[PDB]
């Protein structure tokens with residue numbers, strides 16, 4: 001892929017984070033804490049899952065960023081509507097305003113309803129996410145495997161401003177503490 005030149009500088013929005021997350025000073029890394037991180041509750045925070053949004057809002061154009069997923073057993077990545085539900089249980093689906101992929105129990109899947117099996121030959125250490133707002137496209141690329149395509153959502157009905165979306169996953173196993181990191185341009 002030759003999407004690199006629509007590169008945008010993404011930072012994380014502390015105010016949207018689940019109360020157990022730790023966001024780095026530079027707002028480019030997030031990880032699961034071992035407790036409540038001593039923040040007040042607010043209506044923006046994802047309550048049930050270890051999720052956080054990027055600060056940037058997109059309503060036009062083409063945008064590209066990269067995320068490091070090294071050493072993690074579980075995570076979700078992609079974009080979502082600014083209007084997504086924050087409290088209680090919900091599925092990741094385009095009907096609920098999410099365009100995502102994930103790793104879970106040694107398989108990769110796209111967040112369709114129902115979920116779609118992904119075919120990845122080289123487990124990725126870094127993921128590229130490309131959004132074309134006008135075309136209605138969200139695509140995922142395997143940076144570890146020369147940028148090979150992972151998945152394309154097309155005919156997307158965004159229905160509002162989009163935000164970068166992150167889930168660091170639970171760490172019941174003790175093998176998923178590693179952070180998600182926004183990679184430099």
Ligand SMILES: OC1CN(C(c2ccccc2)c2ccccc2)C1
Pocket residue numbers: 034035
């Ligand atoms: O793995 C769980 C998280 N741990 C907490 C904990 C620590 C001591 C006694 C009981 C509980 C905790 C760790 C660090 C900051 C605040 C609380 C045990």
